[PDB]
Amino acid sequence: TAEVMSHVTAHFGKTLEECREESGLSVDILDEFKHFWSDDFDVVHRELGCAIICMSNKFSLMDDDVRMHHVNMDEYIKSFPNGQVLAEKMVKLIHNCEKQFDTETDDCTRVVKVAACFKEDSRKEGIAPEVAMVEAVIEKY
């Protein structure tokens, strides 16, 4: 659901600043991770793919194939209030997106394409949070 997605995003997004330098992710491309969810933000830069790899590896959310670690993701989403309602759905969505971009050779590009797909499908499924909702939870934890 949208509130669980907001907590996941608020928390995961804390690692964006430490990942900017090594990814090339200028604040002019993405200032706050919460904006990932705005209708007015296109999820397309290779640099954001590179940032997402960086951020994910902080929390061991990707495996050695630079794909989602399913068990670690499920455990992560379960760590938030009401997380069990999103965990299986979110892993499914991410994995179903991964399979669409398995032929992309560039890991950074592959992950940003997976990310745009996940945002799309999340909007479609009605679990995509508003930027306001992510912001409302930024203080936690």
Query: Which residues of the shown chain bind Mg ion in the complex (CB under 5 A)?
Result: 24, 57, 60
- What is the closest distance, in whole angstroms, from the C-beta atom of residue 26 to Mg ion in the complex? 11
Query: Closest Cα partner for 12 from 121, 118, 123?
Result: 118
- What's the token pair of residue 11? 């928390």
Query: Closest Cα partner for 44 from 122, 108, 103?
Result: 108
Based on CB atoms, which residue is closest to Mg ion, 17 or 125? Answer: 17
- What is the closest distance, in whole angstroms, from the C-beta atom of residue 85 to Mg ion in the complex? 27
Rounded Cα distance between 40 and 94, Å, is 22
Based on CB atoms, which residue is closest to Mg ion, 1 or 57? Answer: 57
Query: Closest Cα partner for 98 from 133, 70, 75, 77?
Result: 70
- What is the closest distance, in whole angstroms, from the C-beta atom of residue 11 to Mg ion in the complex? 18
Based on CB atoms, which residue is closest to Mg ion, 9 or 23? Answer: 23
Q: Do residues 33 and 18 lie in contact, with contact meaning Cβ atoms separated by under 8 Å?
A: no
Based on CB atoms, which residue is closest to Mg ion, 60 or 82? Answer: 60
- What is the closest distance, in whole angstroms, from the C-beta atom of residue 42 to Mg ion in the complex? 13
- What's the token pair of residue 122? 């999340």
